Swiss-Prot record, chains A, B:
It comes from Arabidopsis thaliana. GO terms for cellular component: cytoplasm. This is 4-hydroxyphenylpyruvate dioxygenase. The gene is HPD. Binds 1 Fe cation per subunit. Its cofactor is Fe cation. InterPro entries: 4OHPhenylPyrv_dOase (IPR005956), 4OHPhenylPyrv_dOase_C (IPR041735), 4OHPhenylPyrv_dOase_N (IPR041736), Glyas_Bleomycin-R_OHBP_Dase (IPR029068), Glyas_Fos-R_dOase_dom (IPR004360), VOC (IPR037523). Pathway: Amino-acid degradation; L-phenylalanine degradation; acetoacetate and fumarate from L-phenylalanine: step 3/6; Cofactor biosynthesis; prenylquinone biosynthesis. Keywords: Cytoplasm, Dioxygenase, Iron, Metal-binding, Oxidoreductase, Phenylalanine catabolism, Repeat, Tyrosine catabolism.
Length: 381, 381
């Protein structure tokens, strides 16, 4: 049941912005770890005296990494005279964000038809404003509303190349890495209470609850009209034996924030081979592979879709598999991206639900929880 | 003339400690960019609730990367109950350091015979104390005095594996990278006034002025008794046409600090090949190569030591060459290591002055300034 109640016209995920202390080093580690190319820059070399920002791209995926410069470089400017290419940026907000959360996502940015209209209708429907709409070089407008914790939902709209003031990077510096990652699939938040978060976000966007099918969570998924912008949210469930990983998140993160980003790959086997090659030489580490019993019980549950050739290929890479009633899903999780046990990345491939592929095809692999658990028990036996 | 006036027994450079906002990402970028192996860790997985610290090693070189966790994790501890493996660490000092300077060196640590004695004699001779001597697991003692800006000189002494509380890292995670880098050669500071800095540091260490032979600088080199611990210091020279890079440093860094670390390589040609391979895939970038005229004029100045086979091999890699009267030196500079135009790295090889090799053999390549300049002019002609 998809009511299609978007209060404004939403298109697709546009970019994810990371607030760091040093954008150069984080950007280079991510570039190598995920196979993302250096696409554009705004920094001292482009006249930006306020913040350094570097964009990585892989297919449609856009990762933005930003860190502040000393405020002394831009003490003489005023908001109308600013050299910052992202007008919402603020030194104190950024330093406070990163000292409070460490490395994490500041903005989930979606492209819309009219950013100003999306901001106005949003706040008229209960959104807490973060930065009012601003028009950039009469060409793009950007506005921000609060999403949860210190994460903002950023609206971007174009009249007619990332953002004004940014520059394309030199051919030399830009090496054409690509491990198969193609676009952002969903972005997930951890909150203390799911109800008020769901009520709040649904209420200013009009996103509807996405169709679902006893460890830690309780979650829900808001989705846009075409279900191409998916925004899951988790809350912890207390009093269990194994303490909630969601509560672990909230303690180390100092409150709500973005938990994981799910990236879609065209060939999840090539992605996971190439990412695993680089794990111990600067890239990313993966959550430990599930017991061989798990793969023994996969025949009986996904026999019709996965040949054991493609199946044993998942065993090599430790991939997890789940299926809904319309589709099937391949997924694996990284270890946390930084010092704290907070944000991590999911690589996914969806097969099914062709018409183009419809969003959420296969679900989000929640069954994999119980399945994994069962496997563990069976492999101990 | 080497007076050998060390006020206490100094051995060698022990490690360099980096204060960052996220130690994981910086460590991984450096590991891949310089070919340093992951050696030890102190973090949540080792019981450290205060700070995450990761050590990289290449030969004798030890790079330590540290970032704070949320203070909430260790709000119940007191200094006697701390879980921090580096007792000098302080959340507010670290956050203030990194918001003020960005990524940079916090500690230059030298090994000595008795850290307590080195601290006491130091402060009795004018050193500003930073952290008093502390004994760790009845085995190692660490003490800190101020060096310049917010950089400290750290004394380390062992009774008899990095530091107590640290753990050796898993064989898997630890990939045996090595591009030839073998030890730290010198660590250089930029200050507003060279005289008071020289007076101050010489006065509490007893380090003597190292033997020397019109662009930006004015510098001097303090050295220990055997001249194996070298501590150059620069100040800016104003009023020139091209603004001092030292003054550029001080403005963007928000005061004095460490400008560059010089790392010695066993084969500088292998190091520079392997580092250059990785420049655009997560590693480091290099200062643009000097004009071919520069290499034309090299025959006439280093003909006796460098064969043109080894010489044209420098042309490939852009290496710079200088010579003193006792030795010869090969050197090249990276672009800055982070967002700000502050800290950078020098790779060097010294050939000459055998007996073991004596410190400073070849000097520090200051002649290369004028030489480079001349070359530029000649290549324009
Ligand atoms: C080896 O030890 C392990 C291995 C794996 C796990 N695990 C996850 O963390 C995990 C996640 C985070 C999702 C997920 O994607 C997410 C939901 O949970 C909430 C709604 C939508 C959504 O996107 C799906 C399955 C998962 N599994 C099996 C724990 C311990
Ligand atoms: C292509 O544009 C360029 C290329 C290169 C340079 N340059 C440096 O930065 C540079 C440095 C930093 C040292 C050095 O190591 C240092 C001293 O200067 C102070 C005392 C001891 C010490 O260790 C030696 C030679 C250098 N040269 C030619 C500027 C602009
Ligand atoms: Co997911
Ligand atoms: Co040098």
């Amino acid at each position: 049941k998809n009511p299609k109640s978007d209060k404004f016209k939403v298109k697709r995920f546009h970019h994810i912005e990371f607030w760091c202390g040093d954008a150069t080093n984080v950007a280079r580690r991510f570039s190598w770890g995920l196979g993302m190319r250096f696409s554009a820059k705004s920094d001292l070399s482009t006249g930006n005296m306020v913040h350094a920002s570097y964009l990585l791209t892989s297919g449609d995926l856009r990762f933005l990494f930003t860190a502040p410069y000393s405020p002394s470089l831009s003490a003489g400017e005023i908001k109308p005279t600013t050299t910052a290419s992202i007008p919402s940026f603020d030194h104190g907000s950024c330093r406070s964000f990163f000292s409070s959360h460490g490395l994490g996502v500041r903005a989930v940015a979606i492209e819309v038809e009219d950013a100003e209209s999306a901001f106005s209708i949003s706040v008229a429907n209960g959104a807490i404003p973060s930065s009012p709409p601003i028009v950039l070089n009469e060409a793009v407008t950007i506005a921000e509303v609060k999403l949860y914790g210190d994460v903002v939902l950023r609206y971007v709209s174009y009249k007619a190349e990332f953002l004004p003031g940014f520059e394309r990077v030199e051919d030399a510096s830009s090496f054409p890495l690509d491990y198969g990652i193609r676009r952002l699939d969903h972005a997930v938040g951890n909150v203390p209470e799911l109800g008020p978060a769901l009520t709040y976000v649904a209420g200013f966007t009009g996103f509807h609850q996405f169709a679902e099918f006893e460890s830690g969570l309780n979650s829900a998924v808001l989705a846009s009209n075409d279900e191409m912008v998916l925004l899951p949210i988790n809350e912890p469930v207390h009093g269990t034996k194994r303490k909630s990983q969601i509560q672990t998140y909230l303690e180390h993160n100092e409150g709500a924030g973005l938990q994981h980003l799910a990236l879609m790959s065209e060939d999840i086997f090539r992605t996971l081979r190439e990412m695993r090659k680089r794990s111990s030489i600067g890239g990313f580490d993966f959550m430990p592979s599930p017991p061989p019993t798990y793969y023994q019980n996969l025949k009986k549950r996904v026999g019709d879709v996965l040949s054991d050739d493609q199946i044993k290929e998942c065993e090599e890479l430790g991939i997890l598999v789940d299926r809904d009633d319309q589709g099937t899903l391949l997924q694996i999780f990284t270890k946390p991206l930084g010092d704290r046990p907070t944000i991590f990345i999911e690589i996914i491939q969806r097969v099914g639900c062709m018409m183009y592929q419809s969003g959420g095809c296969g679900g989000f692999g929640k069954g994999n929880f119980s399945e994994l658990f069962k496997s563990i028990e069976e492999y101990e036996k």
